[PDB]
């Protein structure tokens, strides 16, 4: 059958997994606590169908003598049914089993790239364990998969025929990427991004178990694009007021659009570098304006991948801070029983990732700081989060006040 080339990110993932074959961070993991009755045969059938619909789970990454490639195959898989009701702490035992799974490495040539499992933790409490490899999954795709599985399971339980998936096949993305590889548009994107990162020396960073720290707050003073624009400008201004460097680079993940009308689980976002210059006397207004100008001046070349741009200049990162503004993923129901999704692991982390989580019709925000241990300490990340949020609160109260006239914290 037909084989497709891997992306630059997938090739880097392959090479890093071949370098450190015992590192388990290239596995993202998640679990779904379900408060109700779960019968495992219906769930296994739902997984059987969803794995066929989300064909990124049926990809086989093989090695050749003419290039690393991937193919759509029929990978062998299973779903264990673990019962832990007859033990003292079933929560601890289930978490230990999960931790035992996502801590052992995964071989990419011959081996299972995902893992599904069901656990008894209480008489009416089953947890669905979901592990994937970074080479074929991201968090958004995992949530899409979990939602589709919940819907299909609820449909199969009540005997109804589940509706047709709203997923696009990964082969659409593969063909589009193969045609884009030989694009003249890709050549022009490379030209633009190379002329844009011209005099770009090492960027601004606060770099002095991923360090994760959340903080809930509520600003009283729109859309979800003004929100992300404001958070980008605020993070850049904070880096400029802490490091003293006027030319701040941030990472902005965008969802590339090439013609697909559906979501393709497995298709990842492209993190574009955003360059902001801090002139004296500038305020949040002009910073927002220049950030939007940089966004829409580089959105024309959105498809050029981050990794090709990075190693087309000299590989040690294009940016140290990433802004991820997104609403929460709605809770899912399995057959009529509501479920709560819990992240077990991520792994590949930019040195600092800023995650802002908003809710429709609400003033409450959630600020997450996911950083690299070798670059931050729990006290250093906590002090930075406290300093940035108050600095960001001073920004929201007056968009006309200059950045340099704002006082910083401890």
Residue numbers in the entry: 7 to 214, 222 to 234, 240 to 333, 337 to 431
Provide text from the study.
Nonribosomal peptide synthetases (NRPSs) are multimodular enzymes that catalyze the biosynthesis of diverse peptides with a wide variety of activities. The incorporation of an acyl into peptidyl backbone is usually implemented by a starter condensation (Cs) domain, normally located at the beginning of the initial NRPS module, via the formation of an amide bond to the α-amino group of the first amino acid residue, a process also known as lipoinitiation. Genome mining of two Cs domain-embedded cryptic NRPS biosynthetic gene clusters, rzmA and holA, in the bacterium P. rhizoxinica HKI 454 resulted in the discovery of two distinct types of lipopeptides, cyclic rhizomide A (1) containing an uncommon acetyl chain (C2) and linear holrhizin A (2) harboring a medium octanoyl (C8) chain. Similar to other C domain structures reported previously, RzmA-Cs adopts a “V-shaped” configuration and consists of two subdomains (N- and C-lobes) each representing the chloramphenicol acetyltransferase (CAT) fold.
To diminish the reaction rate, we made an additional mutation on the second histidine of the “HHxxxDG” motif37 of RzmA-Cs R148A to create the double mutant H140V/R148A, which finally enabled us to obtain several crystals in the absence or presence of substrates. We then solved and analyzed these H140V/R148A structures. The overall structure of unbound H140V/R148A is almost identical to the structures of WT and R148A in both conformations. Thus, the H140V mutation did not completely abolish the condensation activity, correlating well with its role in substrate positioning. Based on these H140V/R148A structures and related functional assays, we propose three potential conformational states (i.e., “unbound-bound-released”) within the lipoinitiation reaction cycle catalyzed by Cs domains. The major conformational changes during this cycle reflect the relative positions of two lobes, in concert with the binding of substrates and release of products.
